[PDB]
Amino acid sequence: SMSVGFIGAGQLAFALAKGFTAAGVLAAHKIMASSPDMDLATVSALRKMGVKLTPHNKETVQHSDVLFLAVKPHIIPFILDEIGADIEDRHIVVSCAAGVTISSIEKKLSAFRPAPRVIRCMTNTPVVVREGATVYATGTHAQVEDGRLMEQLLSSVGFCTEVEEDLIDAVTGLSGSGPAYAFTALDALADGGVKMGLPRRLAVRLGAQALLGAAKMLLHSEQHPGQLKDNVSSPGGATIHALHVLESGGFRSLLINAVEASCIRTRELQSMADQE
Amino acid sequence: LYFQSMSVGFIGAGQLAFALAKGFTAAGVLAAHKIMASSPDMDLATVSALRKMGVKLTPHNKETVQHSDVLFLAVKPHIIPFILDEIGADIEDRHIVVSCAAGVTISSIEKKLSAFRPAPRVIRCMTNTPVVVREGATVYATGTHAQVEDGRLMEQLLSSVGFCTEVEEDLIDAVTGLSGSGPAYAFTALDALADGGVKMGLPRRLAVRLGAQALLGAAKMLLHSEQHPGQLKDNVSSPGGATIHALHVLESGGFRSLLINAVEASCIRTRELQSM
Amino acid sequence: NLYFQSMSVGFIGAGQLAFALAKGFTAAGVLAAHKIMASSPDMDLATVSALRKMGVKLTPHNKETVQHSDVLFLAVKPHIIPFILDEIGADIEDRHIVVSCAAGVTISSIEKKLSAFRPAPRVIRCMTNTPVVVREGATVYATGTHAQVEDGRLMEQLLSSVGFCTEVEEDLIDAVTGLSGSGPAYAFTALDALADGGVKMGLPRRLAVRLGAQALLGAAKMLLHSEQHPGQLKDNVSSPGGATIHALHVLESGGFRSLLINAVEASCIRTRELQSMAD
Amino acid sequence: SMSVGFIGAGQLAFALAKGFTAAGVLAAHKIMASSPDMDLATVSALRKMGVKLTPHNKETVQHSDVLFLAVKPHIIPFILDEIGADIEDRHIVVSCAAGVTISSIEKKLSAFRPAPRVIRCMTNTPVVVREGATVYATGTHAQVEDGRLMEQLLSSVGFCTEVEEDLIDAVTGLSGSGPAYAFTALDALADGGVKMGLPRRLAVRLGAQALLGAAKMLLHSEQHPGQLKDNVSSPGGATIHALHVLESGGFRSLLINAVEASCIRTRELQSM
Numbered sequence A: 001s002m003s004v005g006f007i008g009a010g011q012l013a014f015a016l017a018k019g020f021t022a023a024g025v026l027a028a029h030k031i032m033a034s035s036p037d038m039d040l041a042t043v044s045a046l047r048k049m050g051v052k053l054t055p056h057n058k059e060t061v062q063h064s065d066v067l068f069l070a071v072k073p074h075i076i077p078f079i080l081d082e083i084g085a086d087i088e089d090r091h092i093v094v095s096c097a098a099g100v101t102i103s104s105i106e107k108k109l110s111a112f113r114p115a116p117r118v119i120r121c122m123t124n125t126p127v128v129v130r131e132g133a134t135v136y137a138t139g140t141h142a143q144v145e146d147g148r149l150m151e152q153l154l155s156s157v158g159f160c161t162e163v164e165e166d167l168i169d170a171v172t173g174l175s176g177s178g179p180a181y182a183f184t185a186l187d188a189l190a191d192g193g194v195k196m197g198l199p200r201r202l203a204v205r206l207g208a209q210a211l212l213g214a215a216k217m218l219l220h221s222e223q224h225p226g227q228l229k230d231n232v233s234s235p236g237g238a239t240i241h242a243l244h245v246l247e248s249g250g251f252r253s254l255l256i257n258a259v260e261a262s263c264i265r266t267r268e269l270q271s272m273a274d275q276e
Numbered sequence B: 001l002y003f004q005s006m007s008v009g010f011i012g013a014g015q016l017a018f019a020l021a022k023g024f025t026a027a028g029v030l031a032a033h034k035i036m037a038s039s040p041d042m043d044l045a046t047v048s049a050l051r052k053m054g055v056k057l058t059p060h061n062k063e064t065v066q067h068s069d070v071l072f073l074a075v076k077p078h079i080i081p082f083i084l085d086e087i088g089a090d091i092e093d094r095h096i097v098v099s100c101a102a103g104v105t106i107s108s109i110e111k112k113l114s115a116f117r118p119a120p121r122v123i124r125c126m127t128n129t130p131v132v133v134r135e136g137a138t139v140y141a142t143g144t145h146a147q148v149e150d151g152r153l154m155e156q157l158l159s160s161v162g163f164c165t166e167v168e169e170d171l172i173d174a175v176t177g178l179s180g181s182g183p184a185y186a187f188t189a190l191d192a193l194a195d196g197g198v199k200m201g202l203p204r205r206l207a208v209r210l211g212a213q214a215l216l217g218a219a220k221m222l223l224h225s226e227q228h229p230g231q232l233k234d235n236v237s238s239p240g241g242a243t244i245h246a247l248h249v250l251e252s253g254g255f256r257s258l259l260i261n262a263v264e265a266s267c268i269r270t271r272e273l274q275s276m
Numbered sequence C: 001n002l003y004f005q006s007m008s009v010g011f012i013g014a015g016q017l018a019f020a021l022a023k024g025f026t027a028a029g030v031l032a033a034h035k036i037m038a039s040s041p042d043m044d045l046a047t048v049s050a051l052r053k054m055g056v057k058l059t060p061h062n063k064e065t066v067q068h069s070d071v072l073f074l075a076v077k078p079h080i081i082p083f084i085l086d087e088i089g090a091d092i093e094d095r096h097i098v099v100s101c102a103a104g105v106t107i108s109s110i111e112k113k114l115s116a117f118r119p120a121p122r123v124i125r126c127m128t129n130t131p132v133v134v135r136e137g138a139t140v141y142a143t144g145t146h147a148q149v150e151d152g153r154l155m156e157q158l159l160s161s162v163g164f165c166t167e168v169e170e171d172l173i174d175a176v177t178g179l180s181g182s183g184p185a186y187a188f189t190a191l192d193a194l195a196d197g198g199v200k201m202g203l204p205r206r207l208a209v210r211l212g213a214q215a216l217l218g219a220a221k222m223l224l225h226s227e228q229h230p231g232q233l234k235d236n237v238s239s240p241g242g243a244t245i246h247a248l249h250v251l252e253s254g255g256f257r258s259l260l261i262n263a264v265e266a267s268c269i270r271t272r273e274l275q276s277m278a279d
Numbered sequence D: 001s002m003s004v005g006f007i008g009a010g011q012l013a014f015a016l017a018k019g020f021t022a023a024g025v026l027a028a029h030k031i032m033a034s035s036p037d038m039d040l041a042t043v044s045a046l047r048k049m050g051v052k053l054t055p056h057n058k059e060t061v062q063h064s065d066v067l068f069l070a071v072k073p074h075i076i077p078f079i080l081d082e083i084g085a086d087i088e089d090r091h092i093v094v095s096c097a098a099g100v101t102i103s104s105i106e107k108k109l110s111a112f113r114p115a116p117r118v119i120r121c122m123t124n125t126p127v128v129v130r131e132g133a134t135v136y137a138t139g140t141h142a143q144v145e146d147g148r149l150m151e152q153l154l155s156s157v158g159f160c161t162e163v164e165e166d167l168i169d170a171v172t173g174l175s176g177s178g179p180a181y182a183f184t185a186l187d188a189l190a191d192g193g194v195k196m197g198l199p200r201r202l203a204v205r206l207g208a209q210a211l212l213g214a215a216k217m218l219l220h221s222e223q224h225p226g227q228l229k230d231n232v233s234s235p236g237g238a239t240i241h242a243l244h245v246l247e248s249g250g251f252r253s254l255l256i257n258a259v260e261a262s263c264i265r266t267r268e269l270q271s272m
């Protein structure tokens, strides 16, 4: 029942706006988004939603109480310089950008007005179906109710928890990049279904249902994923035969490699940002 | 009206019998006491879980057959002919026999039971453990003498606990490799993703939660999207970014091939289980 | 406080397994060594010398072991089983319980040979392992057609004195052979390698061996006394960002898990193939 | 008589607390553990045991005679700053942290009182079943009886020996991380049994028993682990066939790689 803004009108702005309005926590008309190119396909999607669109980032700031920064990490410093003087006492600035530290944001903004209210989050694209995974850290001058408000809002579109900021790059490598790992696994599983004689449409549907179902089981269980895996693996059966071939390929190591590589690239990019 | 006075039985009181019983009762489809399950060893952890559920248990498969309208065969494939010999003379015209056993053909079951009575009503099914959270993936094929309402009853019953669709029987071995074994692939992946989070500094509990939420959310997005998995992948993969870096390391280990390998190995083993 | 005062035990074969079991039983106090007899055609083996020092009766003649024994262990190589059954089949009596320890050899095949001489041989098949020598064996057994219920009970009592023991269906025994029968060799290989790792990083070999073996022993005991999944116990060792999780990743990268699955499979398959050639 | 404290109330504090009380060396109520998060599973487990719990590390220090530092390496200098002024002459400070040097600990504590008694330790979680593998090195001001007391205490929960401090990073890689390698191996061995037709519960029991028995054999034998392997490996048989497939995957190299990777990471944990 408050005004929300997005600097950037891309994949994430759309996913979050769609999630929030689907959840009934925000009205489309109370959301404004800005982008230099008002022609992107995400901008058309946001427009069909009933979100207000403008090329001017200063309008989005003036409209908003909660302001999401939804631009690529290297654009963050530029927009902070652009609208730093327009930030007001009322604003909660929520950065969604991978890698970008609360300290870097607070430093740019504090030049214009002291005590900016800053929250850093990492979320993912499934907020669009209200099954996101979101973490946030509160800044130096965030009020206690600011983190509570943020958890309330982001909980409407998935799992939300507060973390120490020093965990966010790792979360980025796991749940931020995680959907892409799943989409790749699902395409491959469907290819396997197809190789064994299934129609593609049926293979995609069953693969995706299998992954959704397994994930829900784990979330609702008190047991270790190893135990749930044990329960599927009948002695001498089809499943244990398949698990062996995954093991022989170092399947588990690949997913460990993936989380590590995404985390390291996130950290590495911010080092370049900090040096620059 | 299908579930109004239906009695269900399970030959086998193991992981699948428990999973389906928990799902059916959670769904509100059947009262727990309207379900019976039988096993030689009544001291398994699965028999104990079923007992606390309120499900009637007995060591005698004949008693399960007499109680049941719909009779689920939930034993290892090599035990199916043994129990068909045992209780085949007790299978009346009224029974719908639902084989959940990997690989075991409708033909083989009908050949056995037809020696006792001429028109045994036989359905073959492949399902998975996530029926326990009503997010299963189920296929069924109807036998020679299954009536039109038998398939509708089966679709209604198995749709209460997740996805369900009728298929040609010749797809079922493939489905086994994809969605039957699928949850085990997911559990392995989630354990490995959590290990990745942990290597990069996340507490285990948070890493498990975030990984599972990421998979669940991505699966949901795919099911609700009109777009190809590769396109959804592209929406997460920012140029030069963390995610595309992680995807490369997955590609470098042949991640996709491993999942194809798994679906294939499970399907091939299911085919061997029937020959043997 | 167990002791079989009326039980005479014999081993046909005086090798690694006969020594391991005799040593375990006598350490357990359930049998006096002079109530044990073992036979082998080679009476100049280290295992024969070790049995002699221990107080076990030795003879070259298998018929003497049979005549001494109530419980008769067949502790010869699988391919030697048919020969010794032909040799002593006519000497089997009502009182004998024949306990085959041979890898792969079916109750069926043993019962078929002995039944030619005298019907209703009481036969039990077991799979054990060398750690019975320190009373920490892993033993399974299956009862034959003519085995009394008191026969299985007695054998479990005896074999439980030297480690874990449980009854199984005979069709699981080749797989047990691949896991717990061959298992100690997998462990000895792992301990040698872990010690080499300790030495590479600067430890004296003796300390490296002690610490590695203690780590494995302790971990195994933890799992046995825990209600938690081995994955959960692993998780508790693995501090975020820490040493352990880094080492686990390099294990995963080499397909460590697959290798152990490969080993159990290969040992089980070889066990089945050898019998298939025998039969 | 002895009061024991843990700064940190996580996996290690729980394991050691469980071991010591199971050994009958300490009454649970003579142990106090502290943690800023009192809503952890480990804290609840310690609470059920009868261990005293507090969010205040100073309370743990004042309670304790032997004070175990059971926090992550990077937290160590923070808590040394915090409670350094509360360290008394009676205290033996026992650091269990991976990689953290006696030198670094004495440097911090020596700013407050001149002769802090510091012991560095590496142990492992099987202390919970009194079969831990523990090593320790004594600091500059640790008396001979401090080392003896520590050996008596840690020997009640498993193997314990004194080493030179320069060996501890390598021990961390072997016995510190070792139980996790064993749990991985046991899970995989059980998967193998299940593949070949065994029930999971039986496969887990048998695999664990096989490992326990084999380890015990080696500890009670004067023979090389290669010779013990030979005694299981009949010519042409099942075991030698399985050993070949292990060799073909470079099984031994993987375990060497693991010990090295843990030791090297332990050395990095300190350097930064």
Ligand SMILES: NC(=O)c1ccc[n+]([C@@H]2O[C@H](COP(=O)([O-])OP(=O)(O)OC[C@H]3O[C@@H](n4cnc5c(N)ncnc54)[C@H](O)[C@@H]3O)[C@@H](O)[C@H]2O)c1
Binding pocket: A007, A008, A009, A010, A011, A012, A013, A034, A035, A036, A037, A040, A042, A057, A069, A070, A071, A072, A073, A075, A078, A079, A096, A097, A098, A122, A123, A124, A125, A176, B235, B236, B237, B238
């Ligand atoms: N897509 C994901 O999976 C995901 C998930 C979590 C977090 N994020 C984070 O969200 C941020 C944006 O990601 P995305 O995928 O939506 O980016 P993307 O390119 O879709 O969208 C970026 C938007 O920023 C706009 N933009 C460029 N310059 C601008 C400026 N000066 N002022 C205002 N807008 C400008 C672009 O026109 C575009 O509309 C990144 O920092 C990323 O780390 C992305």
Ligand SMILES: NC(=O)c1ccc[n+]([C@@H]2O[C@H](COP(=O)([O-])OP(=O)(O)OC[C@H]3O[C@@H](n4cnc5c(N)ncnc54)[C@H](O)[C@@H]3O)[C@@H](O)[C@H]2O)c1
Binding pocket: A231, A232, A233, A234, A235, A237, B011, B012, B013, B014, B015, B016, B017, B038, B039, B040, B041, B044, B046, B061, B073, B074, B075, B076, B077, B079, B082, B083, B100, B101, B102, B126, B127, B128, B129, B180
């Ligand atoms: N677990 C899964 O993920 C899953 C999913 C779909 C289908 N299935 C199929 O279900 C079947 C059962 O698998 P599970 O995982 O439940 O096996 P699991 O080992 O529980 O065993 C099932 C039950 O069969 C019982 N049984 C053995 N002999 C019997 C007899 N003579 N009479 C009655 N009961 C007997 C066992 O005692 C046990 O209670 C298999 O054919 C499998 O392919 C399993």
Ligand SMILES: NC(=O)c1ccc[n+]([C@@H]2O[C@H](COP(=O)([O-])OP(=O)(O)OC[C@H]3O[C@@H](n4cnc5c(N)ncnc54)[C@H](O)[C@@H]3O)[C@@H](O)[C@H]2O)c1
Binding pocket: C012, C013, C014, C015, C016, C017, C018, C039, C040, C041, C042, C045, C062, C074, C075, C076, C077, C078, C080, C083, C084, C101, C102, C103, C127, C128, C129, C130, C181, D231, D232, D233, D234
């Ligand atoms: N060693 C293990 O790890 C182990 C574990 C479990 C089961 N087993 C089984 O135990 C059996 C023996 O194994 P082992 O390791 O003790 O063998 P090994 O060679 O040490 O001993 C074999 C013994 O049989 C004797 N022998 C040969 N021909 C004979 C004959 N005609 N009559 C009597 N004795 C004869 C040999 O002289 C020797 O004393 C095998 O079937 C093996 O599968 C071995």
Ligand SMILES: NC(=O)c1ccc[n+]([C@@H]2O[C@H](COP(=O)([O-])OP(=O)(O)OC[C@H]3O[C@@H](n4cnc5c(N)ncnc54)[C@H](O)[C@@H]3O)[C@@H](O)[C@H]2O)c1
Binding pocket: C236, C237, C238, C239, D007, D008, D009, D010, D011, D012, D013, D034, D035, D036, D037, D040, D042, D057, D069, D070, D071, D072, D073, D075, D078, D079, D096, D097, D098, D122, D123, D124, D125, D176
């Ligand atoms: N887990 C093992 O297998 C093992 C074995 C030997 C040594 N260690 C060492 O023990 C140390 C702790 O490992 P763990 O696995 O028990 O850690 P883990 O996180 O379970 O527990 C650490 C504990 O420290 C607490 N803590 C954090 N900050 C604190 C502070 N400022 N004051 C007091 N307590 C604080 C945490 O809340 C938690 O209770 C590490 O240095 C590790 O190298 C672990």
